[PDB]
Amino acid sequence: QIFLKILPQSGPIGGIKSMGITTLVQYAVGIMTVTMTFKLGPRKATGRWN
Amino acid sequence: HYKVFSPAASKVCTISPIMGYSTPWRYLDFNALNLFFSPL
């Protein structure tokens, strides 16, 4: 399993008038590329007429 | 016998009456795709 989340970022804290603990509004995007290999077996030989 | 094949003609016929020779020999004919491939 591949777990993804966005690392939270803290809001400003300091001389501003009672900001309080907040979190920066951040969302993540990306391109997830998956490559699967499949072993493949040859078709069985056939001797039918039809 | 080598025979002469030559019918009489005058109903639609060829441009001209045909003629040829028939030989005592037989020959092989396998000019067909389905002879080499089964349906499968």
Å from A49 to nearest chain B CA? Answer: 6
Å from A28 to nearest chain B CA? Answer: 55
> Of chain A residues 3-22, which have a CB less than 8 A from chain B?
none
- All residues of chain B having their beta carbon less than 8 Å from the beta carbon of residue A45 are none
Give the Cα separation of A49 and B34 in Å (integer): 12
Asked how this structure was determined, the answer is: cryo-EM
Give the Cα separation of A15 and B23 in Å (integer): 119
Resolution, Å (one decimal): 3.1
Angle at CA of residue A39, ends A33 and A42, nearest 5°: 135
Q: Helix/strand/coil (H, E, C) string of chain A?
A: CCCCCCCCCECCCCCCCCCCCCECCCCCCCCCCCCCCCCCCCCCCCCCCC
